[PDB]
Amino acid sequence: STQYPVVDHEFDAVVVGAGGAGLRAAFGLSEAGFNTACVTKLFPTRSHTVAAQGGINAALGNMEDDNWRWHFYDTVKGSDWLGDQDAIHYMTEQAPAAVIELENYGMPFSRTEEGKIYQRAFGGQSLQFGKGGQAHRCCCVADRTGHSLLHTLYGRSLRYDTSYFVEYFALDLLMENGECRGVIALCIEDGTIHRFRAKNTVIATGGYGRTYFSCTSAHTSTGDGTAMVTRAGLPCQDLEFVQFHPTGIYGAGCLITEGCRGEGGILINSQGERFMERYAPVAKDLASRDVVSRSMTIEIREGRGCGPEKDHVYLQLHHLPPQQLATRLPGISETAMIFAGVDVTKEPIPVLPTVHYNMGGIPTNYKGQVITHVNGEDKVVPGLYACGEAASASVHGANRLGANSLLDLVVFGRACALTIAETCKPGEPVPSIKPNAGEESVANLDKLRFADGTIRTSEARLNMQKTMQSHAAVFRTGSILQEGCEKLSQIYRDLAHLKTFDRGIVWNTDLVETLELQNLMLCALQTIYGAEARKESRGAHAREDYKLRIDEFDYSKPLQGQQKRPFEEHWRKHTLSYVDVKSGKVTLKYRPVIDRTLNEEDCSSVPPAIRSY
Amino acid sequence: ATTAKEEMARFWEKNTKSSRPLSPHISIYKWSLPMAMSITHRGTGVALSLGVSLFSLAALLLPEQFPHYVAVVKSLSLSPALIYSAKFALVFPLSYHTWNGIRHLVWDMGKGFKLSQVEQSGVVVLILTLLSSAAIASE
Amino acid sequence: ATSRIKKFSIYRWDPDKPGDKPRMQTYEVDLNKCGPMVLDALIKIKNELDSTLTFRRSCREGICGSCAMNIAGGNTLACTKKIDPDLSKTTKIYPLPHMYVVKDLVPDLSNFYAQYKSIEPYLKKKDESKQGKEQYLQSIEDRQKLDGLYECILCACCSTSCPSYWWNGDKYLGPAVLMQAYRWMIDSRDDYTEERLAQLQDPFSLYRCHTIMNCTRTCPKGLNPGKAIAEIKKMMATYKE
Amino acid sequence: SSKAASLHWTSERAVSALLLGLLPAAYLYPGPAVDYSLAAALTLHGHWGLGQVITDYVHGDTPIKVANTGLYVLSAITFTGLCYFNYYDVGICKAVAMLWSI
Ligand SMILES: *Cc1cc2c(cc1C)nc1c(=O)[nH]c(=O)nc-1n2C[C@H](O)[C@H](O)[C@H](O)COP(=O)(O)OP(=O)(O)OC[C@H]1O[C@@H](n2cnc3c(N)ncnc32)[C@H](O)[C@@H]1O
Ligand SMILES: CCCCCCO[C@@H]1O[C@H](CO)[C@@H](O)[C@H](O)[C@H]1O
Ligand code: SF4
Ligand code: F3S
Ligand code: FES
Ligand SMILES: [K+]
Ligand SMILES: [K+]
């Protein structure tokens, strides 16, 4: 050797990540009596959650009569029927309660004339199960809702005995006989190693938009938690479903909230058309993201792109009252200027679809427990939980509704807190771990620390980011997807020629970024190989060489006298990816989509049907 | 988990015994008019103070009363210029500190805090000082 | 072619280099093949010339507050600070001022963090037996009082720019924290005003502020910590019980 | 009282205002009354003023204690000298008119 010192920690439970999901599960546990430990690689308030703008959905009814079941409906239709409706049941029925909790904590929600929480319009959201017109259930704090939401949560956590370990990098899970014994990590401040023996581990580490070259995500969204599970021999789910947000400013890729269109802002091309009226006669600009992005994409490569390169489009806001802009969208107004010199009251905002959110993630049940799939049956992995963007419950399926992640965060983060609280008891004897538990992680660490090859970290990463960006975008195809696989597989191989320079251990971000590359690559492989395998069009996954959505039945005609297709012959099912770490070979399997709700009498399960906005 | 006080006490405990350097400050920080006028308010205050203290002492210790030292000065037919100057260097600190001193009492009412107002007042203070000095040193 | 080379002098130091001493290192960057922000420049250098150049960063859009540092004399967010087009000037870059340096441009903000904690930056109602049932009522009017106070991102630029902080940083809260102490004093939903003021009854926490105003000038989100501190003082002198 | 700190602050500014209102007085009504009023207001403002400076720059229990004590003497002797000057000599106001007559 041990050329590194190891300190073993003993806790009832361990939380990994301090964004929305993380903080809420962490103090939820301590709030329940357990001796919790929160491990994060960033100071809590620096998490990508703090960058969120638009809002968090809840059927409060502060703007009009609402029904949480209509909210449910929206999300199921939204997920092109790939979302587990039981998960979607819980998420949408707990929402009002989740939001009110936030306001009761301190969240400075913008107010109505009645002294209540202000809600705006957002994409793919209606009343009366898709018949009663546009809805207004996106609770918010101007256009800085993520900022406030995280700042409040961190503030709330300062009230319990939760032990935090900030700027600690998590390496892998402490696995023993199919169960999780904790996690191992590197203390970046003083370069030491740490193993946390706990009866329960919760992972909420974010997504991995940084697998691509153009994303809205932060440089710290490197899917670290996703890779840890993989190295455990556990499957990740639906990683091929990548959401491209419609409005990410040109050049910097920074995000421009959907809230803009929700206040009146529209889309316009070179000639000046509001093309969305053409593609989506009703929803127009408030159609689903997956739908909208393809629309933009088309207008461009088709010839009507804007700018000096005819490569982007225009988001117009200036036709709206200056007061409303300064009151609803003050954030983006300050961003436009600093990154495009645009003044939202005088000129349009240059934008184009940008990698933004990951629908796929570590598979769990509606209780936040991590599951595995063996011989056609899901089975919970004792001691492991997941929530946040790093998880796949999966409330979002093949297309996430705007303002549903921030909701998911708080709802499931608490759920992990509740499930554990009802399952285990604080104080229960912590599991033993073999003396050498984790030496291989250290091993890898040391190897990357003194790496001296031909291809430096910054170069490999840039090769990965450019292949995803070319072989797995809004529109995808078999040949192009096939090449991207070859290209990536080669790069993953070339990682053996990696070269690093910093030979220190304290705040060696040269090293850390190399640990993250291994992480991003794993995520990327499963993404592109899963994409190549899925020959159908569903949500954010459009194959021009397979333009139809293949379900077990053809729901374009009456079901009477129809032959239900075999599991093996249709694609209405989650993807299950596995990776041969040492070689980097992808292995896929598939599991069924959960369509039953938590209670049929209370919330009707919703069957497939044509998906149009 | 540790308390805020437990963290502060341990913060100094670890860093005061490390080999970590202290990032520079005064030597590398950019100045501004407000910032400079701020230090100057303090300097003139201290000087004004010592001045008044140096006066009470001389009163308790010197041999002659004040009237005699005033004569000892007049029987020196000093260049009125040197006279003027001496009067200017006499009332400049007092002048500055007072106007700027007023500026502070206004701030204490929470008015004039916009950064562009801090500059404006700073400059009005600088012209009132000069004008109210030249005048006195000439009377 | 037509490059455009620019020199950056940046502060260095390695805790793992035995007996190493702070020093400046210069780097030349072609502005033609780089982003317009100093952060963009700092990342280019690390990826292509000295991957040992250590520093904090995340969001790259000036909202997480990670890239705080002293760029050309003034504290700011490297991710939203424009690189100077003037090639005749070498831009120096330091860590936040008067801070214990962990490595290169990474300061130790753990006292800053605890200071924040100590003002209890969370809603406290006298009757907390109803937390979770219904929305608390707050009018448009009272909500407006929070504008310019909640936007803070705790970057520590203001506090590390204030001379009083430099001198009594161990007992003086500093602009950041104080403006958040005010953020909860004027929140129409908080019932602990007097207690939050009671806590500032000492020679240091609040009174080390002599209105220098380095804070307001330096804030990246355009906040006015200095004026918030001014209003506290008025409350300190006008409350009772 | 518990509210000591905020009371000191208020008094300071009041005294500041007081001293500012004496300036107009010493030039329009020079005499005993103003003369002594200045000695008092000048000593107090100066006293509280130099203390804030000691507070910012002096650290360590001893130094602190020393600085404050040394300052307490400086003040008391100053108020004393001024009063002496006001009783045994012409007085502050008159001395200025005389200095300025040179
Ligand atoms: C990028 C983005 C996303 C976004 C948005 C605007 C932008 C610019 N606006 C949204 C909105 O208005 N409404 C909504 O519902 N969603 C919106 N999103 C998406 C959403 O914000 C994200 O999906 C969500 O923030 C996910 O957050 P989560 O709680 O899952 O975490 P995180 O914020 O990403 O933070 C990750 C945490 O994990 C820790 N971590 C990561 N790796 C490690 C390792 N290796 N070791 C230890 N800890 C680790 C981080 O420190 C962090 O706390
Ligand atoms: C050390 C004394 C010299 C500094 C005095 C003026 O300094 C100048 O003040 C102006 C006004 O705020 C700023 O805009 C300039 O950048 C600054 O250099
Ligand atoms: S008040 Fe301003 S400078 Fe101070 S920490 Fe907040 S945003 Fe950063
Ligand atoms: S610079 Fe400092 S002294 Fe007061 S006004 Fe700002 S906190
Ligand atoms: S990286 Fe987030 S503030 Fe700059
Ligand atoms: K996900
Ligand atoms: K209040």
Side-chain angles (χ1 to χ4, degrees), chain A residues 313-462:
Chain A
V313 310
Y314 280 4
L315 167 51
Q316 181 168 304
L317 299 173
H318 69 270
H319 67 294
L320 305 154
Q323 203 295 304
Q324 156 179 53
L325 289 168
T327 299
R328 302 305 192 208
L329 308 168
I332 65 82
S333 305
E334 175 64 52
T335 289
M337 190 55 87
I338 314 172
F339 290 86
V342 172
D343 176 319
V344 311
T345 70
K346 298 157 161 42
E347 283 300 289
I349 305 171
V351 297
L352 83 132
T354 300
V355 167
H356 179 75
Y357 175 73
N358 281 121
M359 274 66 90
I362 306 173
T364 84
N365 54 21
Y366 76 79
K367 291 185 160 183
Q369 310 178 304
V370 171
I371 59 172
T372 175
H373 197 72
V374 185
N375 292 309
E377 68 145 287
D378 316 313
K379 299 197 63 179
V380 165
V381 188
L384 189 65
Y385 290 74
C387 52
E389 194 180 329
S392 186
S394 75
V395 297
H396 322 302
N399 181 207
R400 179 175 74 71
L401 288 179
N404 258 13
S405 179
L406 284 173
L407 171 51
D408 165 8
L409 296 198
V410 286
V411 166
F412 295 101
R414 178 162 189 64
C416 293
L418 299 163
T419 295
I420 310 179
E422 67 183 64
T423 292
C424 300
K425 203 82 178 63
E428 278 172 347
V430 59
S432 178
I433 61 177
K434 62 180 182 182
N436 74 300
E439 75 183 304
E440 292 191 59
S441 297
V442 177
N444 180 63
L445 176 149
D446 196 287
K447 183 196 69 200
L448 294 174
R449 178 187 181 187
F450 292 100
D452 197 311
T454 327
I455 300 158
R456 60 190 300 160
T457 313
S458 64
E459 207 183 309
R461 191 174 55 215
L462 184 61

Side-chain angles (χ1 to χ4, degrees), chain B residues 113, chain C residues 158 161-165 172 174-175 178 208-216 225-227 229 233:
Chain B
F113 271 89
Chain C
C158 50
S161 74
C162 176
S164 311
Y165 199 75
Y172 174 51
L178 293 172
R208 276 321 84 200
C209 181
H210 310 296
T211 315
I212 290 170
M213 284 302 287
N214 253 17
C215 52
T216 289
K227 176 174 162 63
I229 295 181
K233 287 175 178 168

Side-chain angles (χ1 to χ4, degrees), chain B:
Chain B
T2 64
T3 77
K5 284 176 181 172
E6 309 195 309
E7 291 170 48
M8 303 183 329
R10 175 193 45 166
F11 163 74
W12 293 102
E13 198 296 313
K14 178 188 78 178
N15 284 311
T16 58
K17 64 178 184 177
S18 87
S19 58
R20 291 179 179 174
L22 193 84
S23 64
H25 39 273
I26 193 66
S27 82
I28 63 87
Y29 213 76
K30 176 187 196 175
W31 289 78
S32 74
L33 194 41
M35 185 190 188
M37 277 181 82
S38 185
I39 180 51
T40 289
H41 190 235
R42 162 160 292 187
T44 55
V46 162
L48 286 186
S49 257
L50 307 189
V52 177
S53 284
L54 265 181
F55 181 68
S56 58
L57 281 179
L60 304 159
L61 309 178
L62 294 185
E64 306 293 305
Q65 301 272 75
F66 192 61
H68 168 276
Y69 295 91
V70 173
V72 181
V73 183
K74 287 188 198 180
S75 68
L76 292 161
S77 276
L78 299 186
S79 55
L82 180 58
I83 286 182
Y84 185 82
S85 322
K87 294 185 176 181
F88 204 65
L90 228 308
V91 80
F92 190 73
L94 172 63
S95 185
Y96 176 83
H97 188 94
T98 302
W99 294 117
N100 188 271
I102 296 171
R103 179 148 168 254
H104 271 273
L105 298 173
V106 187
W107 281 327
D108 292 325
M109 300 184 288
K111 303 193 296 182
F113 271 89
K114 156 154 49 183
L115 193 57
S116 71
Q117 286 172 282
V118 176
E119 299 283 24
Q120 296 178 312
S121 35
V123 172
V124 161
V125 169
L126 286 184
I127 175 65
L128 289 176
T129 297
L130 191 85
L131 276 168
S132 76
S133 284
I136 288 199
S138 86
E139 54 179 57

